[PDB]
Amino acid sequence: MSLSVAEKSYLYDSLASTPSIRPDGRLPHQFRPIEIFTDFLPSSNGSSRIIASDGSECIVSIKSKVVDHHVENELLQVDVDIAGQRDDALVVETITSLLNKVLKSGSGVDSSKLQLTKKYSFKIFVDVLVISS
Amino acid sequence: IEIHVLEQDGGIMGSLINGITLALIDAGISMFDYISGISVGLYDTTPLLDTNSLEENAMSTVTLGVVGKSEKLSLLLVEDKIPLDRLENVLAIGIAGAHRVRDLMDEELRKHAQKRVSNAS
């Protein structure tokens, strides 16, 4: 966005109130209303569809694959697409590289539940398409 | 014009065009006409309206970009190998399909179009 300077003071004024004030005036800990849909891409292992209040829009797909869990280290892969942008851009790649760290295989991920055999397991694909933000 | 191909079922080319014809009317952009699209396949002698990707890899297929109610074409694309002699008949198939396409687009917009002003006003 490109906003105007006279707002930017007032916006920085009102939110930095000591009885702090949002532009929509929520309580300081609130979030905004959303919508959450899933289970709608029946070719997939799982699907997802989420709706923001400003009309920001994404869908994340779940496809799986069986793999040898010894020849491969990363058992869980995230891959992200933002509409309107190049692959090469910054905000793409950082958010992309982030959720890999967020879903490291034994950090908050319980890869034993992913484990198929003593030799095999499940490669998963967190595949992300953002319409708009 | 932004495209997001989600689930793919074969017949992929004419699938697009029918989505386009919505989207231009979806803002109400100035235009002449409906434009319809459909892949129709050929198993040995027999035309197949509305093939799927299983059938697409199984035989020869042709997609037609058909304009409105007419007999004039926007898109015509053939990859597979086709014996010549069927082709006039093959082309004669898809029009009745294509006319039923822009048929079903129309009322479906219209019942939406009624839903506006009846509750707008």
Partner: peptide, 27 residues
Amino acid sequence: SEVITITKRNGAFQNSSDSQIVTPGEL
């Protein structure tokens, strides 16, 4: 007394004065 509206609906892409109303291509 809340933070966010989280209401769920799973298994679907979507939930699913008279005058002349005309279309393009139409006479």
